[PDB]
Amino acid sequence: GFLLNEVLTGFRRNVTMTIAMILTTAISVGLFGGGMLVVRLADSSRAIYLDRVESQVFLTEDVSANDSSCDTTACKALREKIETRSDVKAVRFLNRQQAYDDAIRKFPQFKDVAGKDSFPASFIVKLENPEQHKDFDTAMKGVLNQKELIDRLFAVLDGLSNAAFAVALVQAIGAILLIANMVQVAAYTRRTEIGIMRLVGASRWYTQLPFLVEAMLAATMGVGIAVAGLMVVRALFLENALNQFYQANLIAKVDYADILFITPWLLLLGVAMSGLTAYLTLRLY
Amino acid sequence: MRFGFLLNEVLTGFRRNVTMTIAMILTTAISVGLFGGGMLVVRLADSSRAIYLDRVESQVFLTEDVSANDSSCDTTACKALREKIETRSDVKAVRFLNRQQAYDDAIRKFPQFKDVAGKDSFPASFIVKLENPEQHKDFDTAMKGQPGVLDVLNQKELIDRLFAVLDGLSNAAFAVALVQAIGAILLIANMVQVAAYTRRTEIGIMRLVGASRWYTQLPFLVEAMLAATMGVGIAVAGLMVVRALFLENALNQFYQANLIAKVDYADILFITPWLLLLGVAMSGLTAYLTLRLYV
Amino acid sequence: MMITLDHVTKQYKSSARPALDDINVKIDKGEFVFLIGPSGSGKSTFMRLLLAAEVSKFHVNKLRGRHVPKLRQVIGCVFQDFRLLQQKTVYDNVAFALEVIGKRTDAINRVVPEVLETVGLSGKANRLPDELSGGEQQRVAIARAFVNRPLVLLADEPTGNLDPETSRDIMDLLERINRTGTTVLMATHDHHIVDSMRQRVVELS
Amino acid sequence: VTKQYKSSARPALDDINVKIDKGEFVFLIGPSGSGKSTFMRLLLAAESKFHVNKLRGRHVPKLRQVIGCVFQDFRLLQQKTVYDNVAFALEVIGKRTDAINRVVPEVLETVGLSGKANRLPDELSGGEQQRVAIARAFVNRPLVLLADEPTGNLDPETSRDIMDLLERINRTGTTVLMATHDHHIVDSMRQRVVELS
């Protein structure tokens, strides 16, 4: 630890060829960041929707009025008629109080200008087969439910996520073997540096130490430029992509705090991977 | 003879070094595969014009009976609606369309309804743009209430978001591709360097006894070009398997909901003549120039 | 008489020292020359300028990319580290240089059994092609230069790292090669060379 | 001890057990050259304070820091300078910053070239080229010194100067093992040789 300005000798030997990995491991460590990012935003966006099988009953709202339990004259009949059908499992209802808090907690886009009156009673219910949809909607029509009429966030967000991990893993192995043979040729281009150590009996740790030191520093630079790449590809590219989905109240927004939240995990992954694949090839040398 | 005296020792280059070659395969495969993924979305966005309107109109639907007579119309009510819709204060140019081409292409615009598609179920269009995109709701409020029309269909800022995010990846996949593409270029400069460090006695002996213009760099160029071709092949194979494994489950409903017109795994083979030369030039011309720098 | 450099001065990597000064020497056909040893200087300098610097049909002034390879085939060279690999057999290691020019496939083998006994290698030709001792390395190094019919060959410090009783035989075999029709140029910083041919030379540094 | 380098007849591994380990200047006569290098390479990393290569392990680099060596040719790096080259084998064994530059020109005063420590190694003369390697071979006090062909490729006057420097540097009490290339210089100082096959 007393000597620190000796790993820069390798960089001054080859800037133009040491640079070849920093931008190459950038896609290998930033595609994992993007794949974790889309899963992180998908798990937040799943709250505002419903599950796989669900219905909404918004046809009648004056019979709900302000009473919590739907057992007031005709409200008893309207609550009792839900479970009369055989294609349901359980019944539930929400009061007038559950009309503005759920529209503010689940929707941070706006928390006011509602008055707990625009959202009626839920009377939501789940079914078995998600195929008839409209027939079950018209079963009690006498109901703003979406169900699976549009299948986008259920499918394409997970598909692009699993496609991002596949394109990460198809060249992550190439990155791991590129580290190993790259530090192998970095040792092979300086035969005398290793040989003078073996002649004077230097320790086996300290002989392969500066290769590992420059490997961690250059991999840390690679993870940093990948984090910068994910920060810029949200900003410079796809500007009118997530904001206009957020203002449409369809996809939950993403801020820049979760990039920082996954950043130490990303550095730990890059550092551990680079150390494992450098010690494995310097065990031979 | 002429194709065998050079084929015998180039395989010894892969045999003597098995690790750097697969590095070039797996890195060049991304510089071609991700570029193909970025080119498919561009060739999909322009092919999604057949079922979408362009940047601004407001489609209006009118009653069939006033359009059911003659070719266009026979009464003065159509002409009155024409002169009322011609000025409309702010706009200046309108389009008058009839029911002959309103059925249009029934196998592409409505491939889900290519059978049950009458020529009288589609009324006249009377389409007109707007000078600005921010007054669409005002125009829809102003148009409705006039008798003789059915409904007004807008196509902007309710459906066009998905086209906006579609082209967003076009200038996003190219950025990630071109970041690592120059790394894939420069790796080819040191492929010959690693071959020269691993094999310096043969190149030194050939330079000592005498080598022609194309004598000893030809194995390096073939080892670069065939690696580029194998990288392009594994790139399009990986693109095919990732599309058919992770994208068909998301594009079937989008084709069903009539949001993308074409969507097919045949444009991938339609661009591979356009794609193979870009894969081998960035690994071949770089190797042909870096040997002038080295020897 | 074509092998003659007059008033030619160059420095190793533009050094302040004159290095190779304007040395005027004329070499006729089959004229043996050694190195006078200017205080044991860097013998890589002033020896490698005969080809690829900074000799029969072209001088040292006509330099081009299509001029060096044609006139590089009339000249051979003998190095020190022998440039012989253990990954290829010794019988074909001398035959590697033939296809760099390019001849017929059957034309390769019609000359090997009348050149691999000129330096003497029939006793050790195919067996032990990888585990090859240092004695025959100079034999195969000299035989690599005789696969063609060159005029002049460069042989700098060919004694290696071995005892002189097994080094004098290289000069003994090279002595009878000179009157075959080729010129041998020698470059070593060793004594007892003037007692081999007994001819007066010049002393230039 | 006994070893086999290959699967053929080895003229160097004759199971010859000769050792002095306290002589002033003894050296090995080499008939083959390559086979003489195995005896020098036997002392470290083949198969003193301890009895040869017996009971090796992770304490091998502790004992390889005592003897040291010099090659026939080069052992050089051109990125550094001659001062960095001669002091390069001082911080890799572990020393204080004042301990490394505690005495600089003792090692350059024993080689005959003193001062001008800022030259690049490429600017050195050919006859004094391996002089920096001989200087690096004795930067600290050794117990032995296996000079495998220290004469190398050099002029006869420069080789005589290098041999005189080697025969003077061991006046402290070390042992310098030359490897023989000729038989008119190396048998001209009346020092012991070896008999082998």
* Last residue before each break in chain D (C–N > 2.5 Å): 47
C89, two tokens: 């057999």
Q: Do chains B and D touch (3 or more CB pairs under 8 A)?
A: no
The residue count of chain C comes to 205
Smallest CA–CA distance, residue B21 to chain A, in Å, is 10
Q: Is C118 exposed, middle or buried (0-12, 13-18, 19+ CB in 10 A)?
A: middle
What's the CA gap between A284 and D62, in Å, rounded? 21
**For residues B123-146, b (16+ Cβ closer than 10 Å) or e, as one string?**
bbbbebbbeeeeebeebeeebeee
CB atoms within 10 A of CB B167: 18
Q: Give a yes or no: residue A247 inside a domain.
A: yes
Residues A132 and A166 in one domain: no
How was it solved? cryo-EM
Residues B45 and B78 in one domain: no
Q: Give a yes or no: residue B227 inside a domain.
A: yes
Contacts of residue B21, defined as CB under 8 A and 6 or more positions apart, other chains included, come to: B13, B14, B223, B227
Contacts of residue B140, defined as CB under 8 A and 6 or more positions apart, other chains included, come to: B58, B152, B154
What's the CA gap between B284 and B217, in Å, rounded? 11
Resolution of the coordinates in A?
A: 3.9
Chains in contact with B, counting 3 or more C-beta pairs less than 8 Å apart as contact: A, C
CB atoms within 10 A of CB D45: 14
What's the CA gap between B149 and B147, in Å, rounded? 6
Which amino acid appears at position A80 of this protein? E
Contacts of residue B211, defined as CB under 8 A and 6 or more positions apart, other chains included, come to: C69, C100
What's the CA gap between D53 and D33, in Å, rounded? 22
Written as one string, the DSSP assignment of B67-101 is: TSSSSS-SSHHHHHHHHHHHH-TT---B----STT
Task: Please report, to the nearest 10 degrees, the dihedral formed by the alpha carbons of residues C160, C163, C166, C169 taken in order.
Answer: 60
DSSP single-letter state for residue B126: -
CB contact under 8 A, A167 and B34: yes
What's the CA gap between A277 and A285, in Å, rounded? 13
Of B157, B127, B139, B149, residue with least CA distance to B59: B127
Of A97, A127, A148, the position where a domain reaches its end is A148
CB atoms within 10 A of CB B104: 14
Which amino acid appears at position A119 of this protein? F
Chains in contact with D, counting 3 or more C-beta pairs less than 8 Å apart as contact: A, C
Distance of CA C195 to the CA centre of its chain: 22
* Last residue before each break in chain C (C–N > 2.5 Å): 54
The answer to whether B38 and B177 have CB atoms below 8 angstroms apart is yes
Q: Give a yes or no: residue B1 inside a domain.
A: no
C144, two tokens: 């690599």
Smallest CA–CA distance, residue B148 to chain A, in Å, is 29
Smallest CA–CA distance, residue D132 to chain C, in Å, is 17
What's the CA gap between C146 and C167, in Å, rounded? 20
Q: Between D126, D149, D156, which is nearest C41 by CB?
A: D126
CB contact under 8 A, B213 and C83: no
CB contact under 8 A, C69 and B211: yes
List C-alpha distances in Å: A283 to A189, A212, C114: 18, 12, 49
What's the CA gap between D163 and D186, in Å, rounded? 9
Strands C3-5 and C25-27: antiparallel
Q: Give a yes or no: residue A239 inside a domain.
A: yes
Distance of CA B22 to the CA centre of its chain: 28
Helix (H/G/I), strand (E/B), else coil: C183: strand
B219, two tokens: 């194995």
C12 touches chain B (CB under 8 A): no
Of B103, B124, B157, the position where a domain reaches its end is B157
A48, two tokens: 């505002």
Domain of residue A186 covers 8-47+153-282
Of C159, C179, C155, residue with least CA distance to C169: C159
The CATH number that applies at residue B107 is 3.30.70.3040
List C-alpha distances in Å: D38 to B184, D34, D56: 45, 7, 18
Helix (H/G/I), strand (E/B), else coil: C9: coil
CB contact under 8 A, A155 and B249: yes
Q: Is the dihedral of CA D6, D7, D12, D17 positive or negative?
A: positive
Contacts of residue C36, defined as CB under 8 A and 6 or more positions apart, other chains included, come to: C201, C202, C203, C204
Residues A273 and A223 in one domain: yes
C184: β partners: C153
> If you measure CA to CA, which chain C residue comes closest to D37?
C161
Residues B84 and B36 in one domain: no
Residues A158 and A277 in one domain: yes
List C-alpha distances in Å: C203 to C38, C41, C44, D18, D189: 8, 14, 18, 48, 32
CB contact under 8 A, A177 and B254: no
Residues B123 and B174 in one domain: no
Distance of CA D102 to the CA centre of its chain: 24
Does C76 show up as a binding residue in the annotation? no
Residues A191 and A104 in one domain: no
The answer to whether B291 and B213 have CB atoms below 8 angstroms apart is no
Measured CB to CB, residues of chain B less than 8 Å from chain C are: 1, 5, 16, 201-202, 204-206, 208-213, 215-216
Count CA atoms closer than 13 A to A105's CA, side-chain side: 6
Q: Between B34, B164, B183, which is nearest A240 by CB?
A: B164
Helices marked H in chain B: 7-16, 19-45, 76-87, 136-143, 161-168, 170-198, 201-209, 218-246, 248-256, 272-294
Q: Give a yes or no: residue B147 inside a domain.
A: yes
What's the CA gap between C22 and C8, in Å, rounded? 5
The answer to whether C89 and C126 have CB atoms below 8 angstroms apart is yes
Q: Give a yes or no: residue A2 inside a domain.
A: no
Of B257, B252, B70, B283, residue with least CA distance to B181: B283
Smallest CA–CA distance, residue B22 to chain A, in Å, is 7
What's the CA gap between C32 and C185, in Å, rounded? 6
Q: Give a yes or no: residue A168 inside a domain.
A: yes
C138, two tokens: 């100079």
* Last residue before each break in chain B (C–N > 2.5 Å): none
Domain architecture of chain C: domains with CATH: 1-74+150-205 (3.40.50.300), 84-148 (no CATH)
Q: Give a yes or no: residue B2 inside a domain.
A: no
Q: Do chains D and C touch (3 or more CB pairs under 8 A)?
A: yes
The answer to whether D140 and A201 have CB atoms below 8 angstroms apart is no
Q: At what angle do helices B19-45 and B170-198 cross, to 10 degrees?
A: 160
A35, two tokens: 């794949």
- All residues of chain C having their beta carbon less than 8 Å from the beta carbon of residue D72 are 161
What's the CA gap between B24 and C179, in Å, rounded? 54
Placement of tokens 């919590």 in the chain: A68
Contacts of residue C114, defined as CB under 8 A and 6 or more positions apart, other chains included, come to: none
Distance of CA B8 to the CA centre of its chain: 41
The residue count of chain B comes to 295
Contacts of residue C205, defined as CB under 8 A and 6 or more positions apart, other chains included, come to: C21, C38, C39, C41
Of A60, A50, A51, A49, residue with least CA distance to A82: A60
C72 touches chain B (CB under 8 A): yes
The residue count of chain A comes to 285
B59 touches chain A (CB under 8 A): no
Of A170, A38, A35, A159, residue with least CA distance to B247: A159
Residues A24 and A69 in one domain: no
Strands D69-70 and C3-5: unpaired
CB atoms within 10 A of CB B213: 8
CB atoms within 10 A of CB B237: 12
Written as one string, the DSSP assignment of C25-91 is: EEE-TT--B----SSS--TTTTTGGGSS----SS-SS---TTTHHHHTSSEEEE-SSTT--TTS-HH
Helix (H/G/I), strand (E/B), else coil: C125: coil
Q: Between C39, C161, C165, which is nearest D155 by CB?
A: C39
Largest Cα separation within chain B, whole Å, is: 97
Q: Is B224 exposed, middle or buried (0-12, 13-18, 19+ CB in 10 A)?
A: buried
Residues B151 and B110 in one domain: yes
CB atoms within 10 A of CB C144: 25
Q: For B116-120, which contacts have Cβ atoms below 8 Å and span 24 or more sequence positions?
A: B120/B64, B120/B68
The answer to whether B6 and A150 have CB atoms below 8 angstroms apart is no
What's the CA gap between B102 and B121, in Å, rounded? 9
Contacts of residue D31, defined as CB under 8 A and 6 or more positions apart, other chains included, come to: C163, D196
What's the CA gap between A156 and B247, in Å, rounded? 7
Helix (H/G/I), strand (E/B), else coil: C10: strand
SS (H, E, C) chain D: CCCCCCCCCCCCCCCCCCCCCCCCCCCECCCCCHHHHHHHHCCCCCCCCCCCCCCCCCCHHHHHHHHCEECCCCCCCCCCCHHHHHHCCCCCCCCCHHHHCCCCHHHHHCCCCCCCCCCCHHHCCCCCCCHHHHHHHCCCCCCCEEECCCCCCCCHHHHHHHHHHHHHHHHHCCCEECECCCCCCCCCCCCCCCCCC
Smallest CA–CA distance, residue A278 to chain D, in Å, is 21
Of A124, A148, A172, the position where a domain reaches its end is A148
Of D184, D144, D172, D171, residue with least CA distance to D64: D144
Residues A192 and A255 in one domain: yes
Contacts of residue B183, defined as CB under 8 A and 6 or more positions apart, other chains included, come to: A20, A21, A23, A24, B27
What's the CA gap between A221 and D45, in Å, rounded? 38
CB contact under 8 A, D31 and C191: no
Residues A174 and A269 in one domain: yes
Q: Between A150, A155, A171, which is nearest B27 by CB?
A: A171
Based on the structure, what is the number of domains in chain B?
Answer: 2
Q: Is A268 exposed, middle or buried (0-12, 13-18, 19+ CB in 10 A)?
A: exposed
Count CA atoms closer than 13 A to B47's CA, side-chain side: 15
CB contact under 8 A, C163 and D183: yes
Residues B282 and B237 in one domain: yes
Of B32, B16, B20, B8, residue with least CA distance to B229: B32
Largest Cα separation within chain A, whole Å, is: 99
